[PDB]
């Protein structure tokens, strides 16, 4: 039972690492725009 | 005593994962008004 308390904060760190990937394209996206913006 | 010291450190990463999902939210914010504005 305490391994799986252990796994499910596993999976809510994956899912902070999915939303970490997220947010990098997010800034990707950003950085982008201000290229194109600067051209 | 060291299992409270670790306790406190989830704590923090649940506070970390919390910053996050509310970081994830104001990508998707983001992302609504970004579509809005190309429409």
Redesign the interface.
């Known amino acids: 039972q305490n391994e799986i308390r252990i796994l499910q904060?596993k999976l809510?760190?994956t899912?902070?690492l999915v939303?970490?990937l997220?947010?990098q394209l997010?800034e990707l996206k950003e950085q982008m725009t201000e290229q194109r913006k600067r051209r």
């Open positions: 904060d809510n760190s899912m902070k939303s970490h997220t947010a997010n």
